[PDB]
Design a protein around this ligand. Structure first.
Ligand SMILES: Cc1cc(/C=C/C#N)cc(C)c1Nc1ccnc(Nc2ccc(C#N)cc2)n1
Ligand SMILES: [Br-]
Ligand SMILES: [Br-]
Ligand SMILES: [Br-]
Lengths: 415, 548
């Protein structure tokens, strides 16, 4: 009821980010949403003396027909002060990723119950554009904690803890973790029982409220089943020159990650000038070297540690036939996680939809494990991505990304 | 009197840490001073300005300018300094509408609101910053000091505050009259509708009455301006639009500036005149910016111009948007990285046209370019019509599938259909996924001395075939490509090639069909002649025979 003072970082002005083009249906959806929000006092019309802007659009959450407003506060969040006054930080729960089932709840609506510092509201300005700019864009600012703003969970933290206290007491083995608008609830219970605890939570949540449009929903994860990708070498009875070349290449690459990798003896098989498809018998020296390399690759990478002070970087490769590989790291050759997707959620003829889904899934994994999002290196041209990603986006957060324009050779080695 | 609703003033601030202007008033002739005194006396009477005491420490210069071919003077306040110190505002504009996005209207009326333009109140706390001084006769008395009570002409915030204030007024009228459209341009309101003329003119009078609530009168004697409207470089008609006349001059010699002006007109024309091209004419502007320098037109530039003159020989008009019909976008390849398109709903009736040019870069191919053009058109279409058009593209469905399924990047094109109008976009070569049985295997390599820039390129094959060529003025990277080129030249229709060149792999995996490097272009032409090519990479300097 009383506002927490909030400021931008030193020597730093508010966001002035252009609204990107929106389809007719998204505009109409936003006009409807914002009309109601305005009636509820959540947002207010603003004047021309407010020069700030943050882009806005709309999505449809997974398995729903109702539009959700999504503000791209990425710029504002960068420019917003860091919040360590009450707590140095919420130490990330290492147990969350170890639960058998984790449900993700959209509790972003709760934020609207807290007023936003009168002096900071102007920085939350956004615009509903009109088709072809035929009428003036509708300008709003927030009067309450906005969804997607990093300050919202920080300011609402004390309130959420109080809300969750009784449920925690009664269920001490349940792990609850909040990231932005998302609430992650993990347990080792039978899914039927689990879904009953989730519903139990929703009730305890509603009780405080007195209705939330998306609280009823539940997105189920199973992080204990999340798979990794060690380096494996082929097992063959017949090696062609080409096979051996690919093996040496892969080992050469692996030797940047693993010290004792040797290719001397195997390279010695490539002595001479033979047809690529000719079968080469392995020498004893080569088989031993190959065997010793296999053993090395069964071990973890050495000196691999997570540092919360550094960015997480995510790289993705298109492997074809709807398959995608990815790595998360902070330092080159020091992968913190690797994985592969194949499953297609109705995108068998749309690369960009597949990539967008991969990005969201990787981001989810990152949040669960380290409690923050990675910076993506996307194998896609900027213009193609920027034109389409919002059409397939179903999360309430948005990570950072950059674009890869040069084909990596490493694609071959993660295949 | 009839009470009128007051107009909410917009709170205005100076930029952080900045104070108001303190600029010396220029001396003025006795003639100009008298002119300003009368003008300001009148403005003061109307309440637009007020005399202020000597306490106000701010000042902005005022000038008198002789309105040409007349004896009447005009008052000009130079707000350049104050504008530097005034906060940024929100451009209520957001962008200018494109005519192709407009809807056809049976009637469009113009209302003069000029006597509103100058009546918006200025934030009380900011007025002091607008202070100016009329110098006194012979400077024997204090100058007459005034400040503004309304938005001044030339002040940074006047357009934004004016637009927002008029929008606020018009909003409820537009909202409660969804069967009209309203648009403000300068000091005029444009009101369009499809209503029966009678119902329409009633709407106009109702708007006049609505505006009266804020004490805003509009001239009974209706506007002189009538369709067609000249607006932002366009001509708007009730049921069609075009660009204002495009006249390409005859000239014996062309200057940098002239060419810039030519390209500008061509660019402007290209949004409704199909097939406009500017590649060769823009090429003449490469790197140099001496606006007076004369450039000889290339023979290629001359043809391009001649082609344009033909396209421009007679008027072309676009139609307006029909929301009940699909948008269709058709694209053609023009050559030299040039692409042109038309957007229409009915055959032979374009809403608009346009062009796309290849991005600068080392290597490229038609499919990438076509893809980029699609994304440009898609984005432009969202802006103008709020939806993606269905595309008609000169590329076969099978060609596209082969491309995107095998391309290393994610790529996508929205709903589209093949249109069989040459030249078609195709794949010129496709590398094998597996080594070729029975095909000779070429192990290639090259190297150069960084100092003397002498090098060698060559190959050895499984059949004993060998070649080494000595090269001058070269680099390691160049020799690596030359080696691949030699293998392609000296091999049969099917060939396996083994290289350690990461550089060459990076280029070829990008699948260029055209390049800035003539060597790459030579490689491409060789690839096109092959039936099967498998390219294999190995790491260098690891004892790999053949490659060793
Ligand atoms: C942008 C705009 C500029 C002018 C005028 C600008 C000036 N000068 C006049 C109007 C009414 C509008 N607004 C809209 C909105 C939707 N459809 C249309 N269609 C439309 C507009 C003019 C003519 C004509 N003649 C025909 C159709 N106009
Ligand atoms: Br005036
Ligand atoms: Br023109
Ligand atoms: Br079509």
């Amino acid at each position: 009821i009383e506002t927490v003072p909030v400021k931008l970082k030193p020597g730093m002005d508010g966001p002035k980010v252009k609204q990107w083009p929106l389809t007719e249906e998204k505009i109409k959806a936003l006009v409807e949403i914002c009309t109601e929000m305005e009636k509820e006092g959540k947002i207010s019309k603003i004047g021309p003396e407010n020069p700030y802007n943050t882009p806005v659009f709309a999505i449809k959450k997974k398995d729903s027909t109702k539009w959700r407003k999504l503000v791209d506060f990425r710029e504002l969040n960068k420019r917003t002060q860091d919040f360590w006054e009450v707590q140095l930080g919420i130490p990330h729960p290492a147990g969350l990723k170890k639960k058998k089932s984790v449900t993700v709840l959209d509790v972003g609506d709760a934020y609207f119950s807290v007023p936003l510092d009168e002096d900071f509201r102007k920085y939350t300005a956004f615009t509903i554009p009109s088709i072809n700019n035929e009428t003036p864009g509708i300008r709003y600012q927030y009067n309450v904690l906005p969804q997607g703003w990093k300050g919202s969970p920080a300011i609402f933290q004390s309130s959420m803890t109080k809300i969750l206290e009784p449920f925690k007491k009664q269920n001490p083995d349940i792990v609850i973790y909040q990231y932005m608008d998302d609430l992650y609830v993990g347990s080792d219970l039978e899914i039927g029982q689990h879904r009953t605890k989730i519903e139990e939570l929703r009730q305890h949540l509603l009780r405080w409220g007195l209705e939330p449009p998306f609280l009823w929903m539940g997105y189920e994860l199973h992080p204990d089943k999340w798979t990794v990708q060690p380096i494996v070498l082929p097992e063959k009875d017949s090696w062609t020159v080409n096979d051996i070349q690919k093996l040496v290449g892969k080992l050469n690459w692996a030797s940047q990650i693993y010290p004792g990798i040797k290719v001397r003896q195997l390279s010695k098989l490539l002595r001479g000038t033979k047809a690529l498809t000719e079968v080469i018998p392995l020498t004893e020296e080569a088989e031993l070297e190959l065997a010793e390399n296999r053993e090395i690759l069964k071990e973890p990478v050495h000196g691999v540690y997570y540092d919360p002070s550094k960015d997480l970087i995510a790289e993705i490769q298109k492997q074809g036939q709807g398959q995608w590989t990815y790595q998360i790291y902070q330092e080159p050759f020091k992968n913190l996680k690797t994985g592969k997707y194949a499953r297609m959620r109705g995108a068998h003829t749309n690369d960009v939809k597949q990539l967008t889904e991969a990005v969201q899934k990787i981001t989810t994994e990152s949040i669960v494990i380290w409690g923050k999002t990675p910076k993506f290196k996307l194998p896609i041209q900027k213009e193609t991505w920027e034109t389409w990603w919002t059409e397939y986006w179903q999360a309430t957060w948005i990570p950072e990304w950059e674009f890869v324009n040069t084909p990596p050779l490493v694609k071959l080695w993660y295949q | 009197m009839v009470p009128i609703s007051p107009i909410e003033t917009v709170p205005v601030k100076l930029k952080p840490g900045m104070d108001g202007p303190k600029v010396k008033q220029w001396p003025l002739t006795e003639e100009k001073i008298k002119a300003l005194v009368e003008i300001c006396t009148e403005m003061e009477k109307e309440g637009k300005i007020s005399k202020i005491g000597p306490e106000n420490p701010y000042n902005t210069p005022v000038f008198a300018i002789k309105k040409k071919d007349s004896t009447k003077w005009r008052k000009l306040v130079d707000f350049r300094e104050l504008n530097k110190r005034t906060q940024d505002f929100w451009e209520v504009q957001l962008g200018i509408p494109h005519p192709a996005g407009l809807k056809k209207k049976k009637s469009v009326t113009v209302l003069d609101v000029g006597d509103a333009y100058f009546s918006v109140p200025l934030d009380e706390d900011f007025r002091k910053y607008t202070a100016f001084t009329i110098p006194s006769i012979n400077n024997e008395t204090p100058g007459i000091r005034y400040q503004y009570n309304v938005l001044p002409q030339g002040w940074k915030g006047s357009p934004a505050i004016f637009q927002s204030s008029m929008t606020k007024i018009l909003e409820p009228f537009a909202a409660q009259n969804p069967d009209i459209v309203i648009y403000q341009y300068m000091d005029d309101l444009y009101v369009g509708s499809d209503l029966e003329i009678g119902q329409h003119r009633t709407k106009i009078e109702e708007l006049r009455q609505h505006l009266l609530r804020w004490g805003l009168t509009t001239p009974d004697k209706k506007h002189q301006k009538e369709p067609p409207f000249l607006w932002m470089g366009y001509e708007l008609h009730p049921d069609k639009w075009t660009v204002q006349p495009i006249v390409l001059p005859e000239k014996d010699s062309w200057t940098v500036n002239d060419i810039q002006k030519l390209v500008g007109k061509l660019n402007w024309a290209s949004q409704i005149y199909p097939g406009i091209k500017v590649r060769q004419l823009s090429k003449l502007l490469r790197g140099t910016k001496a606006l007076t320098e004369v450039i000889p037109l290339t023979e290629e530039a001359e043809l391009e111009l001649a082609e344009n003159r033909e396209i421009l020989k007679e008027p072309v008009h676009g139609v307006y948007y029909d929301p009940s019909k699909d948008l269709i976008a058709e694209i053609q390849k023009q050559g030299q990285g040039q692409w042109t398109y038309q957007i229409y709903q009915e055959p032979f009736k374009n809403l608009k046209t346009g062009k796309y040019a290849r991005m600068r870069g080392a290597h490229t191919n038609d499919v990438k370019q076509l893809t980029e053009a699609v994304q440009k058109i898609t984005t432009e279409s969202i802006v103008i019509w709020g939806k993606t058009p269905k595309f008609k593209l000169p590329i076969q469905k099978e060609t596209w599938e082969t491309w995107w399924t095998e391309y290393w990047q994610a790529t996508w094109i929205p709903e589209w259909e093949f249109v069989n109008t040459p030249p078609l976009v195709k794949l010129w070569y496709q590398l094998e996924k597996e080594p070729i049985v029975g095909a000779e295997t070429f192990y290639v390599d090259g190297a150069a001395n960084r100092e003397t820039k002498l090098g060698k390129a060559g190959y050895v094959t499984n059949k004993g075939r060998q070649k080494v060529v000595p090269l001058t003025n070269t680099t390691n990277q160049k020799t690596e490509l030359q080696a691949i080129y030699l293998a392609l030249q000296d091999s049969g229709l099917e060939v396996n090639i083994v290289t350690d060149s990461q550089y060459a792999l990076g280029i070829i995996q990008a699948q260029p069909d055209k390049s800035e490097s003539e060597l790459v272009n030579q490689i491409i032409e060789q690839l096109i002649k092959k039936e099967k090519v498998y390219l294999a990479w190995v790491p260098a300097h690891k004892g790999i025979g053949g490659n060793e």
